[PDB]
Design an enzyme around this catalytic site. Sequence first.
Site, PDB file in Angstrom:
ATOM      1  N   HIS A 147       0.840  -1.186   0.000  1.00 48.74           N
ATOM      2  CA  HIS A 147       0.000   0.000   0.000  1.00 48.74           C
ATOM      3  C   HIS A 147       0.883   1.247   0.000  1.00 48.74           C
ATOM      4  CE1 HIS A 147      -3.378   2.631   1.738  1.00 48.74           C
ATOM      5  NE2 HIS A 147      -3.723   2.321   0.511  1.00 48.74           N
ATOM      6  N   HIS A 162       1.438   4.128  -3.361  1.00 55.37           N
ATOM      7  CA  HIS A 162       1.253   5.565  -3.238  1.00 55.37           C
ATOM      8  C   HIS A 162       2.560   6.314  -3.526  1.00 55.37           C
ATOM      9  CE1 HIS A 162      -3.020   5.819  -2.222  1.00 55.37           C
ATOM     10  NE2 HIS A 162      -2.876   4.759  -1.442  1.00 55.37           N
ATOM     11  N   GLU A 222     -10.402  10.573  -5.145  1.00 55.78           N
ATOM     12  CA  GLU A 222      -9.220  10.588  -4.293  1.00 55.78           C
ATOM     13  C   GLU A 222      -8.797  12.040  -4.071  1.00 55.78           C
ATOM     14  OE1 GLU A 222      -5.362   9.122  -6.141  1.00 55.78           O
ATOM     15  OE2 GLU A 222      -4.827   8.839  -3.956  1.00 55.78           O
ATOM     16  N   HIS A 259      -9.738  10.244   5.507  1.00 52.68           N
ATOM     17  CA  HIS A 259      -8.658   9.628   6.271  1.00 52.68           C
ATOM     18  C   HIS A 259      -8.278  10.502   7.469  1.00 52.68           C
ATOM     19  CE1 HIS A 259      -7.185   5.817   4.414  1.00 52.68           C
ATOM     20  NE2 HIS A 259      -7.810   6.258   3.342  1.00 52.68           N
ATOM     21  N   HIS A 297     -13.290   2.679   2.737  1.00 49.03           N
ATOM     22  CA  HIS A 297     -12.900   2.333   1.377  1.00 49.03           C
ATOM     23  C   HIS A 297     -14.007   1.533   0.687  1.00 49.03           C
ATOM     24  CE1 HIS A 297      -9.185   3.993  -0.039  1.00 49.03           C
ATOM     25  NE2 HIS A 297      -8.691   3.936   1.176  1.00 49.03           N
TER      26      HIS A 297
HETATM   27 CU   LIG Z   1      -4.443   3.976  -0.437  1.00 47.84          CU
HETATM   28 CU   LIG Z   2      -7.360   5.379   1.520  1.00 46.61          CU
END
Ligand SMILES: [Cu+2]
Ligand SMILES: [Cu+2]
Lengths: 645, 650
Positions: free
Chosen positions: A206, A210, A348, A367, A403
């Site tokens: 993850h 990113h 996003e 988040h 998510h």
């Molecule tokens: Cu992510």
């Molecule tokens: Cu996320």
Amino acid sequence: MNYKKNLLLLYDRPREPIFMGKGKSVFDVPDNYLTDRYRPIGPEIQNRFGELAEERIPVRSIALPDLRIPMSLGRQEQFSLFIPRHRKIAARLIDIFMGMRNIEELQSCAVFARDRINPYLFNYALSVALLHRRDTKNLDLPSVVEVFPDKYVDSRVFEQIREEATVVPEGMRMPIVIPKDFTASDLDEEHRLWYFREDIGVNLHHWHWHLVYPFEASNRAIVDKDRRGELFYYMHSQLIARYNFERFCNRLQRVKRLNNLREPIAEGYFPKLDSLVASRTWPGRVDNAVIKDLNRELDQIKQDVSDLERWIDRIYEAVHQGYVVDESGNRIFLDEEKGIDILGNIIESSILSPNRQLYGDMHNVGHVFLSYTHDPDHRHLESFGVMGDVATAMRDPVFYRWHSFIDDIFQEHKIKLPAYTKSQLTYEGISVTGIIVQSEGAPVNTLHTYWQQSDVDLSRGMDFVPRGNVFARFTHLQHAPFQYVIQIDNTSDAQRMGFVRIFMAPKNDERGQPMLFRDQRLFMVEMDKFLVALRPGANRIRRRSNESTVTIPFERTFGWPAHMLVPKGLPEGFPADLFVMVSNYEDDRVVQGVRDRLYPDRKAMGFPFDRLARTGVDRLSNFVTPNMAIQSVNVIHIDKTVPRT
Amino acid sequence: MNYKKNLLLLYDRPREPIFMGKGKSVFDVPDNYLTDRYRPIGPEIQNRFGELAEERIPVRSIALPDLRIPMSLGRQEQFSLFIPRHRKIAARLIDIFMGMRNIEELQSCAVFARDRINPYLFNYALSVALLHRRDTKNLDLPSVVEVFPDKYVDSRVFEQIREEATVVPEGMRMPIVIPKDFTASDLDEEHRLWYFREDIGVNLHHWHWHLVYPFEASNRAIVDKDRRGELFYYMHSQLIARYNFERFCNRLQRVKRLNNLREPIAEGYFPKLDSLVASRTWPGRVDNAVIKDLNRELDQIKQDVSDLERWIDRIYEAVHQGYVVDESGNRIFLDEEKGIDILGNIIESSILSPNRQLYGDMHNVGHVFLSYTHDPDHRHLESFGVMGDVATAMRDPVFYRWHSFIDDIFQEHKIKLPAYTKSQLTYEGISVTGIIVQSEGAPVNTLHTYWQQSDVDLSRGMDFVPRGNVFARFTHLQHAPFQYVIQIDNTSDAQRMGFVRIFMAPKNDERGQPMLFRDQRLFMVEMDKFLVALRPGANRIRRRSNESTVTIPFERTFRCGWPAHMLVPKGLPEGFPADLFVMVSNYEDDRVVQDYCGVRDRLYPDRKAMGFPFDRLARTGVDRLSNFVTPNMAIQSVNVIHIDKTVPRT
Ligand SMILES: [Cu+2]
Ligand SMILES: [Cu+2]
Ligand SMILES: [Cu+2]
Ligand SMILES: [Cu+2]
């Protein structure tokens, strides 16, 4: 040259000053490169650390742009890419390292900066620069577990590692076992998914995803990777598909989305991590915490929950309308091709969003909200919980709820797309007549899983600890090796090219009924996708589990982790439908797995099952075309610990 | 293997039966592969032509799909991809060749078909298959001039070549001079542009561009190349920019568009070509011919002029509206990025058009209308004029009028796009302080042009002519070699990547003043575009004329891009004034990762729009080139001198 290898020494012991000597080398730093704290006793230091080293690396004194902005973030503070302010700081530092013409000046800039800026930030800024600077290609960046073990390991071990390293001589040091299933007891049913949420592997995947697909940095080409929006949709969408699978293997129902933000969050999570850089621990979240309006003056966050709700309301509207509006006022249409990709950048919030101001920063701000329930106005001078850092976000159960919601929004565009016609997913001439799987010493069509200890040297990450080796023993899910065997008939008279697309879903639901397509299509996890050449007549295709294009080899992690390729299943066996499709590669071909150029498949990501069924289709067994095949697989877990051998 | 080389023998002598023997080889054809005329005398033939051959190629007898549709087109008929019916025939044949398992059957299918279907059609269908098939890559297809010289050469030569080849022994044969400036006298001022319209080079470039980027129904994989719509816009747009340049060098005004289709066409054109395959000549068009409703029952053309007019009216509407509508009824927006690309597919009518039925087949149908003014209802059993074939279309002056109109429609969209901001075309740190050009034995900032004879072997194309060599002497424009020298300052502290973009336009107007931007932007012809690495401080960049990414060398075009010898406009004997322009853009923004000009096989290596600095209108305050410029650009006065002399090829 050497320079490439000398930068890698910066990753060594992040909090030990750069003049203390990394590996079998040491830096010969100017006195104007020493920090204000240490400069007044520079003579005593350079001498004190210089010896017992095979090399002394010289460093030329350069001009160096103003490092005010990079240094604005405190040294003992946490660093997250989700927080608006940090983004501007990192993107500025990235810009400096990126802007150093020579690989020698990069080394000089770095050596100076390293002991003035936040370690977590430095690591990120460097990592990004090296990967995208043109001189430092094809490099091996050290695993971020090895440089920052505090984000991956129960804080309890640290005082054991300190004890072991100080008391016991090298060579006689016992490997430190890393606690597993340690964040919650059996009163919390969520604790069962430790092997997924808290697995080192998936958390690294993850973090790294990113890294290579940032959503805002500076200079649009670095963000602007082919179909990164769709990637963002699909990758995260597969996380939940895999999570929901693992849930079913632990006698739990599918993850419930975050319906609405005003209602309490049932599942709390105390992560048990202690940041050695911040010298504090990450805060936990209590049961039935409520999201609260943020006013973090320092971090530059002034957001109300209603702002989030407003963004969602608008995004839904656009999705139903079928088009979005850019800053200019024009309309852009969410078509079958680029619709999903657009939506991803909108949701996003990547600078690629056609109108950030209107549709907001929906995913990212979520988040932050979730990570600050315990201290939203900064009155308690506390930092963000685990959901505030990409490195740690997947540890929290709420991650999958948030998510999950986000995915539902994507879905409410996918269900508008026209069903794939019988024609569109038929390969005229090709027929798949069967697929099976075989593991050594196990019946056909049977996968096995278990626990397995592996070892990792966390020595480079243990600052101010007696030098030597420090091996840690991780326990993690593992599967016995297997291979697919696929029977394909050509009946054309010419060599046919084809894409093999392999997914796996549960066979039944939570109630024990054979799943319908509408349901099952969303639970299919991709297992492999590879190109194959078929001779006229009959072809026997064989493919090993370790050849998977979804996975990266174990050694690389130490891509999705290889040991997590197969769901856990049950001791009594868990029933699953294995599915394969051979599509016409000529249509799917991208004239030009992960890929540093363009994405090698013209079809949508999750292609067989991303859209609704055509009329008359009801379950998988009547969705199928000739060029597809289904197979009942049984997934057996065994609660035993195998070694690494 | 050999097979690849054996297919190339099919291109040899297209009308000579396949059993007559090509090059140093001959085919050993089955008797069921013979034609009905020749089958009954097979015993006499295979033996008669077996002699004098080094190699003998065997051919296995296979099933062979139905060749009815491919054979529907007559053998002595013309073939054009613009005609609806031909498209369906070719696309079907392409499909057959494409569908053959091994390159043993491709060769077998080909050998059989070759003497049953129209040569022009065969050549196309094969060319398409080979270029896009799996086993047959990097294969050097013979120049279509060499296989079909009738589409490239005054018919007068053919009876001279026949005489020379029959009378004179090999080795003593004189090269046949190919007539130039032969279609019209000096009473027609249009005759001056022969060296461009009728140049072998540019006609080959056009034919080949349409080979690699078809619009044909065919299959979507083959047609769907990156930004082919924008390519179609830009390539054709540059043809007219270059044409308009050459016009100014012959004391003519800019080409007038085809305003409206009801008014007569002033400029007639008799092409002087004789199709040896059709055994007839191409019809001419008279002065003041009028477009007429077509009713070509055979060709499957039932189109009225009003249909064309209706398509145009609708396309204009869409362009002004700012969006189009697909078959489904949804709206697709002509944005800054993909707008032009969409419009291109709409206007030419490529199967990629989001709604062919509504916006029509506007460009292509225009080519047919213009080519059939002399016989629109087929009452005279005549074929289409030169504008009906891509291979020959550029010879006619009306081509530039029709393509000029089409361009104005594209422009109507481009003028809606927001002007490039000072910011958008500035490169922070980079400054270009000067650009110059130098030719051997010539002052600085001076280009020279002249005539030059070159030789081409048309032997492979001369059917039923005594074997041997048959060299033809082409006269064509040529330029003296030169090189650009560009002074760029970095002032950054880091290696900067940049795209060098070089265009050239005329300097002044009709009145003798500096041209205004609005005018001049449309007359800029691309001269080069290449990637450069700049060190901190000062950089001296040098680039040869022969390194141009717009161009391909002589060798290719006589055995693909724009012919090298046509890179520089002609200019005048007294000298023609021109503004040379260079821009260095930030390659990091323009980059398209990836491992030229018009034809690139891969995706197109430039994120910027085609034409880049000049495709859009000026930002406020800008008025002429000299105040459009940013630091990272430079202008230079060049003088283009022609010299009426014939240099050899050496
Ligand atoms: Cu992510
Ligand atoms: Cu996320
Ligand atoms: Cu054309
Ligand atoms: Cu045309």
